[PDB]
Write a protein that binds this ligand. Structure first.
Ligand code: HEC
Length: 99
């Protein structure tokens, strides 16, 4: 529920993701909440990500951020994970503000 704290957590995402609409190592994350999984046109998603389906609901996002490869096995997103539920919740709150 704390976007200010979530903003700090995003420091762990900025190396590959932007919130300005630009795509790089990873797709832009501004507007990601509720967004179609593998829904950014032009971005070269892995096959498992494209086969996943569904939307990036708060629950799907929080699980994915805890362990990317457990949620989308074979994803090309190389990230250790956020083991603290508060960090995940705060980060999601922050992203929701950038919808
Ligand atoms: C680069 C080393 C990354 C870091 C650090 C984080 N992410 Fe990432 N992410 C990256 C790639 C290469 C991809 C594509 C994965 C694939 O298999 O195709 C992604 C993807 C995501 C997605 C899905 C986006 C979509 O449009 O479907 C999400 C929701 C996402 N990444 C979130 C995320 C956050 C919040 C991070 C910091 C905690 C984070 N990523 C770090 C590469 C990298």
């Amino acid at each position: 529920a704390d976007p200010a704290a979530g903003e700090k957590v995003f420091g762990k995402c900025k190396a590959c993701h932007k919130l300005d609409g630009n795509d790089g190592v990873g797709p832009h994350l501004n507007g990601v909440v509720g967004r179609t999984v593998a829904g950014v046109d032009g971005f070269n998603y892995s096959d498992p990500m494209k086969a996943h389906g569904g939307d990036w609901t708060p629950e799907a996002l929080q699980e994915f951020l805890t362990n990317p490869k457990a949620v989308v096995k074979g994803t090309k997103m190389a990230f250790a994970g956020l083991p603290k539920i508060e960090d995940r919740a705060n980060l999601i709150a922050y992203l929701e503000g950038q919808q």
